Amino acid sequence: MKEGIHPKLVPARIICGCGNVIETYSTKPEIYVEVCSKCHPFYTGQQRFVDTEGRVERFQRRYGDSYRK
Template structure:
């Protein structure tokens, strides 16, 4: 691997403002903002809009889509399968 070609890989805090949740991980992401973590060290912090703590799929608040109803409505509106055009 060539030297000085890749960005620095270091500890970074990602903070989900919507859920009030933050986690420490390693990343190449860069930020001017810093935060003091529970271990007393200061790390760069990156604010994100969504994480697993606030995403509807992971929180169980996801809506199911009624695809069968959409197909039936489309066929009623534009004709069934095999038709040449609107009825």
């Protein structure tokens, strides 16, 4: 590699808000990150954040079964 033009790659700690810590390399020694692959809705299983809502519509509607017969 060329001398004098490249940034130093030092051992680096990336820390997330879920507690997961990444042992990696970067140009910044410590970095905190709001989200990671260990706590992200797509990655972490069928974590459907809130969205079971969902494909209920239309005829789970009921309420109820009260027409004259």
